[PDB]
């Protein structure tokens, strides 16, 4: 009996490799001659379903850069509180978290991700925090590999983790390059954070903005100050190099969800960086 299942689960992983192969295909084809990443492009229509013997696959692609990249905190800085830290405190505040706790978490994240082992924040802590735990461990002191690594920082819980999850990510870049064309209207608190309004995204053009300058100089952003615009210009984008694939695979009674992070390697070349079984 176990020979069949093991063969079938193996076959469930191969269908996941099939799912991924299709994703890379769709991405290359829809983005080959395109200079931007927006929601009227073919990759963004989903989900797609394909039959398999004794099952099926369902695939949906999303822009991985449609979120606040926490690894912007890995960026070499030399100011007492960098911009990514300011913006994350503003973001967290907006999830029903008091000013203090929002600061604790953001500063804790900064220290967890920054490569040094020394403290430079009022509330953040390095190895001692983490060696003190029920199961003791060291502070990563590097970019997060997975958004789940944030669960362990000071001042975090399940409720907030799940509130924060749809809005923040862990990409393998230290830049903040948020693709304004692919942000969902539901992720509009990000913009609230970055502007110190679902209206902006609700009224986004069908094929997105041609560039960030066009975004920033629309009537709706008249009264925002120039400094906020100059720094928003360093963190926003109309393009992306990272995508999430969700594949839901069924073989007989076996149901498997796979999340895959895809990187754009060339104009017609996309690759899978890593993948993991995910929650339904």
């Amino acid at each position: 009996g176990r020979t069949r299942s093991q063969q079938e689960y193996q076959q469930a992983l191969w269908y996941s490799a099939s799912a991924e192969s299709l994703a890379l295909s769709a991405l290359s084809l829809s983005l080959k001659n395109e200079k931007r990443v927006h929601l009227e492009q073919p990759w963004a229509s989903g989900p797609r379903f394909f039959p398999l013997p004794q099952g099926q696959i369902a695939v949906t692609l999303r822009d991985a850069q449609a979120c606040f990249n926490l690894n912007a905190l890995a960026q070499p800085t030399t100011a007492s509180r960098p911009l990514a830290v300011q913006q994350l405190i503003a973001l967290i505040s907006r999830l029903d978290v008091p000013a203090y706790r929002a600061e604790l978490i953001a500063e804790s994240l900064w220290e967890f991700i920054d490569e040094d082992r020394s403290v430079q924040t009022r509330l953040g802590r390095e190895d001692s925090e983490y060696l003190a735990r029920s199961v003791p461990f060291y502070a990563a002191n590097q970019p997060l590999a997975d958004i789940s690594e944030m669960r362990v920082v000071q001042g975090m819980d399940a409720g907030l983790y799940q509130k924060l999850k749809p809005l923040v990510c862990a990409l393998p870049m230290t830049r903040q390059q948020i693709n304004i064309n692919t942000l969902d209207v539901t992720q509009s608190v990000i913009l609230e954070a970055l502007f110190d309004a679902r209206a902006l995204l609700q009224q986004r053009p069908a094929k997105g903005w041609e560039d960030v300058d066009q975004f920033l100089a629309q009537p709706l952003l008249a009264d925002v100050d120039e400094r906020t615009k100059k720094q928003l210009k360093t963190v926003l984008s109309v393009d992306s190099n990272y995508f999430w694939l969700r594949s839901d695979i069924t073989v007989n009674e076996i149901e498997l969800t796979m999340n895959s992070l895809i990187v754009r390697m060339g104009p017609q070349h996309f690759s899978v960086l890593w993948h993991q079984t995910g929650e339904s």
Binding site: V135, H275, T277
Partner: protein, 154 residues
């Protein structure tokens, strides 16, 4: 039974290897160590050994302060393939791994596919292979070779 243990073994291996993460780690004292550590004597293996990070822990309530990643390893010890598992990453040296005696086995050899060629050693700090070839000799079965993709198509 001989079959069950082998099926078990292949299951553990497939679940671990196919969800490997390109994540460097801190060792028993906090020293920087590579994402994939592999080669002769890794984890005091009597043959080749390997040690890496993998994801895929499903814990949707996220109730304890823990991520969805684990550190795992394989080695030959006392004439057995053995699986070592730490319950989290960057663990303190006080944190001891579980040990799972798998199939009798006496030599574990590893090759690594970098996207272009098969190579015998792995030395990158951050990067992980596209595929791994494992060979071992089992007294129950003889020589077994298995190829795993670590992260799908490229």
């Amino acid at each position: 039974q001989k079959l069950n243990l082998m099926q078990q073994t292949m299951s553990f291996l497939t679940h671990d290897l196919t969800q490997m993460m390109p994540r460097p780690v801190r060792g028993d004292q906090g020293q920087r160590e590579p994402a994939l550590l592999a080669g002769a004597g890794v984890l005091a293996s009597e043959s080749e050994g390997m040690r890496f990070v993998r994801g895929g822990v499903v814990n949707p309530l996220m109730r304890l302060p823990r991520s969805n990643l684990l550190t795992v390893g394989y080695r030959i010890h006392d004439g057995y393939l053995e699986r070592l598992a730490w319950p989290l990453t960057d663990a303190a040296g006080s944190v001891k791994p579980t040990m799972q005696k798998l199939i009798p086995a006496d030599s574990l050899r590893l090759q690594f596919y970098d996207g272009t060629r098969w190579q015998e050693s792995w030395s990158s700090v951050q990067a992980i292979p596209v595929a791994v070839r494992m060979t071992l000799h089992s007294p129950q079965w003889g020589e077994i070779e298995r190829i795993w993709l670590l992260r799908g198509p490229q």
